[PDB]
Design a protein around this ligand. Structure first.
Ligand SMILES: CCNC(=O)NCCC(=O)Nc1ccc2nc(C)sc2c1
Ligand SMILES: CCNC(=O)NCCC(=O)Nc1ccc2nc(C)sc2c1
Ligand SMILES: CCNC(=O)NCCC(=O)Nc1ccc2nc(C)sc2c1
Ligand SMILES: CCNC(=O)NCCC(=O)Nc1ccc2nc(C)sc2c1
Lengths: 328, 330, 328, 328
């Protein structure tokens, strides 16, 4: 053979930094291209239930291999293809229509997770689970209960995107890059999210100390419209292009980088909140977490104003109202 | 104002970007080009143009929302070409795309008509830009953009066979158990059915695969390496059949070309350019040959030493393209 | 000729993203490798007065070109080599010995700047001047006076590194990546620098709000020692390895990135502060600045406590006293 | 404590992609900075015998942590700091001197390896060893013999740099980026290196097909002078700046990238050549190897002309002559 004329084999194949993306819809493929372009993995595996679509997506990424540093890209409906993953990203399930809450996807997606989650853990016992499908906070709780994994290893993309949207809008109003505009959107990745105005700052300068009316209806510059734009973002983009993909793709690759490179950066992501802010139930929602190689190792206790804390508890209550009725 | 309480302004800046890129067409190809360029930190400004207002705004917003994770501080869009002003590079990914089983050549009149509106609008706002054609049939549309723009030929580049060659190197890599970066091989001529695999130049570590197998790429080849070129030709049709279109690979291929232009690299790429004066071609035919690509576009052409059969295939590719090119109404 | 047999020339220029580094000592070379590895420039020029050392450094960088994306690396004792730079980085001059203040370097470095500055500005109409040599704040005032440039174009590396050191040390104490530890060291890049305790935070949570005694002598955890370690850092590193290079090289490449990519990120860098905190003279020192393609376009007005403001005015008085010793 | 007031700890720490650099001279520190800037490791360990120098270098790197994505930088004279390294890079020993062959360092470097190698293997028995110390080809054989490792895990940086230098020089003559100028320099990383003119090409076009006398004495354009410049490069750089560092650091980081990311790229690096080109002894020298996570898995069999083969056998004979009389 030509290969044997050209190459003398001297050694008789396990990946060290494998990532799996489950679900090849627009979200899944945006996560895949973003991870591929951040050189986070030595192996990328894709999984879906639509055979042709799955093979087409895999081939299209494979054909870009010359321009990447991920030497193996594979796919299958069979979960054996996901074996030995360090990180498994779940982007499978129904997505919200225009005028539909992420909360309305819960029954369809819990039922899908009942199949996906045990199959993922069967082949990747050392992985961290990164939940992206909606409603993310409830689905992170669901994946945790199903997986048998400790809670540090089951992470929801949560408010990492809401916070990036908030920082972009703030940056645009101020003429400062989003990197230098600090601001946290916490709670549900959805309608009941909480903008933490008390912590909004540039170079440690509290914007609320300069303008006490910040984020209230009495604010002359209406900064509450910034949070409203954050809440409405997915709806607005869905109305315009039919779905969202790029921003969530980059937000998930951001979380994947902190995990794969054990950075211990702080992210507002879905985790168990029981024990904080008087929350007594197994509610999962976004709070700033330290994220690394073992997932969520620590939770930051944000000092919230009385109104911010009440809003966060109201967000926990909304999530509990849906979660408490789940059968799985 | 809160901005004023927080910040003292020192001066009113010119605000003209220094590394601006425009992507015309926000379909799946255009958006894959946009994301790949954003993730490669090639531009200080990204502008998007299309004729579908809602889809254009939705795409711009979705990229903008990921700004925190990027290093491109301004992302804008409009149906109006004033949004594209002062672009260093303008990437054209607008027009009809191949349906399942459709030749890229079938898109020619629909895309020439669209180019009649697009090209003058681009040139009006960025008279010094490099034009990078991605729309199909790429080779003929690079000729069309060249003629319409009035630009010198160095500033009108077609993505050509950069992707075909990347597909060839991936497939070769898979057969040899080597990364595609260490597998060398060139696919020339039309970015389509008449492309030419240059078997005589296919190598790993400078070892000619044809020197080990003299029947390489022929019908008499026991390993049927010609099937690698057939897979290259069929790739887009196969991906279209499975997912409905192609995007990732062309997006990565366009960003690779954008990188050589924006960073004045002077790397060699098989891209669409005028081949008149080479291989006995007497006409203004545009097709892929290896070109040195930099800040001024195509500054030089590599003269590939083709075998008589390879040269015959390249002239056949030239004949097919010229047949359509010579009769264009614009 | 073989080149003409292989290549048909089709076209008959000017660099678009050129950077010059003046000084090929350990600092200058650390800036050069950091800039090369960050893909910030299409051309890199080096300038020094020692012919052999300069040529040797240029050649060693050129030999790594295959692994880089900067296609032209050049050098000369003649400033015509720096023509058409967008950014000129000054790392020339005497360095402090153990037990020697950076302020003691003033007369030697001013004399050198009287030659370098007019020669640099002559060939690059669009350049920003980035001063690294010490005392950086004083030398930024000096480069500003000699060049006749507007203040937005004359920047001192200032406290960008002091703040990076502060954030690293804070990160170590908290088990958090420095990227998620926020805190500002302002004023002189030296002994009189000011840690802005009021702005020190993780996820928008003020550390001073949790420990009102933070940074004071009454602090049980002695966070003031973190600022003392920042002040002493260069001297500790000098005593150990003889000089410092890597951290400053990275700090300067971070500033070069904001400039070259027009990021508009906020950095604590040397600029004129006349008109803020009761300062009435042309004092240069570090304050949070928005940095982009036109240099410093905007200054953030940090809200300081009376004690922090008094420490910042003390630093300004120190620097102004040295400025009064300058002979142009 | 402030940390406990701020953060709720949920989880009480082994690196997954650790690299150790042994030797903190100019070569070692250039490897370290290049590896840090390429985001190849989650932990970097430094080892040397000069305690102050070692601590100063580690601190200087640590201070730039905010600008990097390698969260743990550690050092010690004690090899326990190197535990669980995936890759251990040896840069220690006597360095090439002005007007002196790299072969002049052999005995002293063999003696040093008798200490280093058992210490490295004790703490990371499954690492890949990357030898950079000179004479690299003989020291790779030495490291292989002392370590007891299988030959795939003992790699010499070999001719990866000589080939990068060759491609830079070819690129300058042709007006093409070195990435698009292909050519291999094999054999000894030193005076007896072999330029493979038969494989030298641009876009698959053999330069020898355009100039049959390419690289010979009869070559009208005297391309042999390019290989002479490759051979002389370290002697010239040493004469000018005292040592070489930047290019070798980038060449080593290029090899570290292929190992750490399992790229299976082809590199001209030091491996056992017994059984090829009539070589019957345990000689190590550069031939094009496939490099990945298990080190050298395969060797490309280059079709050398009779001239090129005789030149490679001579390089093998020069190395065996020295190696034969070692004792260890
Ligand atoms: C995150 C937004 N949602 C999407 O992008 N959804 C489209 C992709 C998708 O749902 N794939 C998929 C994959 C696996 C799978 N296993 C089952 C038992 S059903 C199923 C469905
Ligand atoms: C390359 C594959 N083609 C696609 O991705 N096509 C979809 C996007 C597209 O065609 N946009 C667009 C943009 C401008 C424009 N100007 C006109 C007069 S028509 C027109 C259409
Ligand atoms: C910041 C730490 N300082 C250093 O790294 N200094 C060493 C490098 C150095 O001083 N170069 C240099 C360059 C130009 C020049 N022009 C003159 C009239 S004197 C002179 C000296
Ligand atoms: C490649 C050029 N060589 C250099 O840069 N060398 C300087 C650094 C150096 O030799 N370190 C060092 C480290 C460990 C060690 N263990 C021993 C028993 S001796 C010894 C010496």
């Amino acid at each position: 053979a030509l290969k044997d004329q050209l190459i003398v084999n001297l050694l008789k194949q396990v990946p060290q930094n494998k990532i799996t993306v489950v679900g090849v819809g627009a979200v899944g493929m945006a996560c895949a291209i973003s991870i591929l372009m951040k050189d986070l993995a030595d192996e990328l595996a894709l999984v879906d239930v639509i055979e042709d679509k799955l093979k087409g997506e895999m081939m299209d990424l494979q054909h870009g291999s010359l321009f990447l540093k991920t030497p193996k890209i594979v796919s299958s409906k069979d979960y054996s293809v996901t074996a030995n993953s360090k990180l498994v990203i779940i982007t499978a399930g129904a997505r919200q229509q225009e005028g539909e809450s992420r909360l309305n996807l819960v029954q369809r997606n819990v039922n899908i997770f009942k199949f996906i989650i045990p199959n993922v853990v069967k082949y990747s016992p050392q992985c961290k689970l990164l939940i992206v499908s909606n409603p993310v906070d409830i689905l992170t709780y669901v994946a945790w209960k199903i997986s048998g994994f400790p809670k540090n290893r089951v992470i929801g993309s949560g408010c990492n995107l809401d916070s990036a949207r908030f920082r972009y809008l703030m940056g645009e109003r101020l003429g400062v890059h989003p990197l230098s505009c600090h601001g946290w959107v916490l709670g549900e990745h959805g309608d009941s999210s909480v903008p933490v105005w008390s912590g909004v700052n540039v170079a440690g300068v509290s914007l609320k100390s300069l303008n006490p009316q910040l984020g209230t209806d009495a604010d002359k510059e209406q900064w509450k419209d910034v949070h409203k734009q954050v809440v409405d973002s997915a709806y607005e983009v869905i109305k315009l292009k039919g779905y969202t993909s790029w921003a969530i793709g980059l937000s998930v690759a951001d979380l994947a980088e902190s995990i794969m490179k054990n950075l211990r950066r702080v992210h507002p992501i879905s985790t168990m909140i029981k024990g904080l802010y008087g929350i007594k139930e197994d509610v999962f929602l976004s709070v700033p977490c330290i994220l690394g190689q073992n997932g969520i190792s620590d939770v930051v206790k944000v000092t919230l104003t009385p109104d911010e804390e009440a809003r966060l508890k109201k967000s926990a209550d909304t999530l509990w109202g849906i979660q408490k009725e789940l059968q799985f």
